[PDB]
């Protein structure tokens, strides 16, 4: 039982923000692993796309490394032009269409961040600091994160972040989750982390939160105010 | 009748004497990466001519650096982009 | 679900919990549409066990996928029982039979469960509340997210969880969260909440946790005013 499964890869924000270009793929796995593989990509107005040319295919080892990147503007794919893919090979005759496209239409809504220290719990117990930031009330989907400590940024896998799942009072909202995870002598240290995230509904398109281990619950206050001349010349 | 409204530190002076002291805040305010200045000093003489914190009307901002897929890049954020513009 | 295929969906231990029971079915996919199929289910011992409750309706995929259905108490299951559903077929002389059984020998560890209360950005805007449930180190990913407003059930509408996702970071640990909405009057009344899991590599196969303001203030103060004329 060989089961032929078929992925694609479209574009995304952070792509469109920073590269500001796109980049669609679509590959076939799971299948006999060599070369003579037939994929070709058109747009709704049936016109020819950038093929995949000069391009990563499957490695000698049967390894399926393929890539692609469509030189078109990011411009088409914000329209949500329908992009169509034909998979085929030359021991499956039978033709395989993907058609993929940007969603016309959505209520754009303001993201809302929030940040949280770690837990005095898992604190005291003195094995790992947790911080979590997450993302209520927004859409649409494909938001990026980014985690940093003392300014300087921080690598991906330091951290995780969840997908935007569906929101039980919004369905047509999403919600995400992203957990930093480091020793507990940063936080304990004082270290203030910082967390950003760039959403499309977002006006300024990026915000960021903050939080040191004073800021996370201060267990204590050191206020130590002075109002020096109570009363002269002002009253 | 009000001598002074200084909404830089929030100190009203009717002649009632309002002062509003929010303790959640960086000791420097370019940046959050900062001390937790706990101190407040009110000079009434100093106040009739270092703020801690924001005024409705006044939309703060900070460089922050990113990195997707390629290099580091410098983009602007505000700190109270609510102020600026669920 | 087609080129002759019979596929195995066990009671998973989210279903043990939450039904309380066993209920074994064995999917047949490509099955001709032909009735009278005589899927009964039996133990990997032979003995006798109680058939499929009927077969299901019919479907646009031109396929009767019947839907064996078993009970038993909790024991068979986690003994090292393996059940054969028979899937009779007229139109096949040398019929296969779906096996199913309980694989075991997993690395063990004991979920660490961490409730988060609202952000404290959220208690300024006053309009709405969440909580946030946190589970990390443990194996296998099956756990299970309750809430309990003082032992009380909750319509599970009002929350939700994200399956396990992976943890890089770690050999493997399998790691998950779910969070709850509420209105922030809710949790400016000073109310109660715990957030149960189900998860087998337990003690007691359940673990508790809760948290409210009193977990969510500061310890003391220091004030000092200085007043005077200079
Ligand atoms: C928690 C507390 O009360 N701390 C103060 C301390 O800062 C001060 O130096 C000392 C002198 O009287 O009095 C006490």
Not at chain 1, 100 to 113: E, F, Q, T, Y
Not at chain 2, 15 to 33: A, F, G, K
Request: hydrophobic share 30%; glycine share 4%; aromatic share 8%.
């Amino acid at each position: 039982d060989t089961a032929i499964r078929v992925f694609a890869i479209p574009p995304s924000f952070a792509s469109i923000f920073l590269t500001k270009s796109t980049k669609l793929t679509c590959l076939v796995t799971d299948l006999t692993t060599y070369d003579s593989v037939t994929i070709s990509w058109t747009r709704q107005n049936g016109e020819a796309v950038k093929t995949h040319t000069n391009i990563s295919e499957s490695h000698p080892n049967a390894t399926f490394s393929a890539v692609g990147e469509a030189s078109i503007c990011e411009d088409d794919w914000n329209s949500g032009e329908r992009f169509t893919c034909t998979v085929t090979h030359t021991d499956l005759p039978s033709p395989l269409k993907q058609t993929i496209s940007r969603p016309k239409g959505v209520a754009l809504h303001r993201p809302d961040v929030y940040l949280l220290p770690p837990a005095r719990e898992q604190l005291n117990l003195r094995e790992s600091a947790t911080i979590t930031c997450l993302v209520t009330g927004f859409s649409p989907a494909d938001v990026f994160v980014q985690w940093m400590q003392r300014g300087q940024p921080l690598s991906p896998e330091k951290y995780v972040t969840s997908a935007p799942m569906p929101e039980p009072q919004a369905p047509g909202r999403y919600f995400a989750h992203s957990i930093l995870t480091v020793s507990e002598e940063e936080w304990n240290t004082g270290e203030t982390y910082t967390c950003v995230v760039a959403h499309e509904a977002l006006p300024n398109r990026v915000t960021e939160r903050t939080v040191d281990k004073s800021t996370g619950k201060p267990t204590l206050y050191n206020v130590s105010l002075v109002m020096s001349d109570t009363a002269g010349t002002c009253y | 009748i009000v001598l002074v409204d200084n909404k830089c530190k929030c100190a009203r002076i009717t002649s009632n004497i309002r002062i509003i002291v929010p303790l959640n805040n960086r000791e420097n305010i370019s940046d959050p990466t900062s001390p937790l200045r706990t101190r407040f000093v009110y000079h009434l003489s100093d106040l009739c001519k270092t703020c801690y914190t924001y005024d409705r009307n006044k939309c703060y901002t900070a460089v922050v650096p990113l990195v997707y897929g390629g290099e580091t890049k410098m983009v602007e954020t505000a700190l109270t982009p609510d102020a600026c513009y669920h």
